[PDB]
Amino acid sequence: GASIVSLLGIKVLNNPAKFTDPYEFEITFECLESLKHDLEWKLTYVGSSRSLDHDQELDSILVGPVPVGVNKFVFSADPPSAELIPASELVSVTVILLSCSYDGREFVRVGYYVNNEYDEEELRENPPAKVQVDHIVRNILAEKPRVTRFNIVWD
Ligand SMILES: [Br-]
Ligand SMILES: [Br-]
Ligand SMILES: [Br-]
Ligand SMILES: [Br-]
Ligand SMILES: [Br-]
Ligand SMILES: [Br-]
Ligand SMILES: [Br-]
Ligand SMILES: [Br-]
Ligand SMILES: [Br-]
Questions:
Q1: Hey, which family's this protein in?
Q2: Domain range spanning residue 143?
Q3: Which residue in 21, 51, 62, 99 has the fewest CB atoms around it within 10 Å?
């Protein structure tokens, strides 16, 4: 049948923000019938393939047992370790992926580009090799999400 769960709404909260501030999304979804499993929402920091920071699962939350109908919650996750961020992640945009899975099967993914920019000109012109995370302003490009749905088996 149709997907048991549909994504109805997503709001990126507290954006822009310090690099060290939690990511926060207010999510509205609906669930059409009772499910055996909870939903697993997770946020993945895609990072940079050249470094040791890539494809990090920041946090997950088990949501359920989900009452049939419209549901709303806030997904929060702390940012990845400042210790692993390479200087290139200021230069080029990075990606964060908010996804939901059911019994390990991903059925919806929302991707966002994230522009990290130093908050003073000298840093922007002459960025230090030791990434000064405390001077990064994180801007999630919230008006250009990439939403992908996957057809999964439910129960
Ligand atoms: Br709203
Ligand atoms: Br808020
Ligand atoms: Br409603
Ligand atoms: Br994507
Ligand atoms: Br910059
Ligand atoms: Br945007
Ligand atoms: Br489906
Ligand atoms: Br689908
Ligand atoms: Br499947």
A1: Belongs to the ASF1 family.
A2: 1-155
A3: 62
